[PDB]
Amino acid sequence: IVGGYTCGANTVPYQVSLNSGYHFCGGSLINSQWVVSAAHCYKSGIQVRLGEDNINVVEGNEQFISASKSIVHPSYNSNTLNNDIMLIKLKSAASLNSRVASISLPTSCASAGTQCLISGWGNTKSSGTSYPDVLKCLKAPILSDSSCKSAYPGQITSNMFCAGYLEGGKDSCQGDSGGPVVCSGKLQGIVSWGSGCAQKNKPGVYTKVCNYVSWIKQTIASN
């Protein structure tokens, strides 16, 4: 997250870190045994880390649970990033509490202008590299479809939305991928892509979660 703020420990209780020996992507806990992330975060050997603030210090609220299964969206296209969503099942259910909690799936899609919370452990610099130990947060509005398409000609599908600031300076970034965009208490987006980070006229692009609720629910119901 570039241009954000320190969230505060366990203030984003649905945020998870995906770990394969190190943090490599975010995700969102959607019930006690399932996480939503980005398909481009797929790999084998995932351990889901819940209850994290500092990802380099055991602070006492963590739960570390291996994945038993990954399910990349049927129609994921890694060239275009269309359908950039996957589900991860935990080998055991997380113990839900105030600090480790699921986030609601949307009933309805969110509109441009709605203010959302984007979070992660990704790079905090738009030039160069600095990766934080503690969770970072950014409040950002959803942008109109028109302005998203104008920023990224030939690239925005019906399964994507833009959020952030056209002036630059405030965005998600590498290492935030797969993490949440939460608006009025519902998971509306997944950190997906963007040209650089926090560049003028290059807002963040996010997977449009409301399009996937039926797939998520029926996948959970049979897996």
Annotated binding site for Ca(2+): 52, 54, 57, 62
Active site residue 177: yes
Residues whose CB falls within 8 Å of the CB of residue 86, separated by 6 or more in sequence, listed in order: 36, 37, 38, 39, 41, 42, 70, 71, 72, 73, 76
Q: For residues 40 and 87, give the distance between their C-alpha atoms in angstroms, rounded to a whole number.
A: 12
Which positions from 44 through 83 interact with Ca ion, judged by CB under 5 A? 52, 54, 59
Q: For residues 99 and 55, give the distance between their C-alpha atoms in angstroms, rounded to a whole number.
A: 15
- Closest approach, Cβ 9 to Ca ion, in A, equals 9
CA nearest neighbour of 1 among 149, 116, 160: 116
Q: For residues 62 and 40, give the distance between their C-alpha atoms in angstroms, rounded to a whole number.
A: 25
Which positions from 168 through 197 interact with Ca ion, judged by CB under 5 A? none
Active site residue 70: no
- Closest approach, Cβ 4 to Ca ion, in A, equals 19
CA nearest neighbour of 82 among 206, 215, 216: 206
- Closest approach, Cβ 47 to Ca ion, in A, equals 13
CA nearest neighbour of 172 among 194, 145, 146: 194
Q: Which one of the listed residues 40, 53, 119, 192 is annotated catalytic?
A: 40
Q: Which is nearer to Ca ion, 90 or 143 (CB)?
A: 90
- Closest approach, Cβ 95 to Ca ion, in A, equals 16
Q: Which one of the listed residues 17, 102, 119, 177 is annotated catalytic?
A: 177
Active site residue 40: yes
Q: Which one of the listed residues 84, 102, 176, 192 is annotated catalytic?
A: 84
Number of residues engaging Ca ion in binding (CB under 5 A): 3
The catalytic site residues sit at 40, 84, 177
Chain residues in the site for Ca ion (CB under 5 A): 52, 54, 59
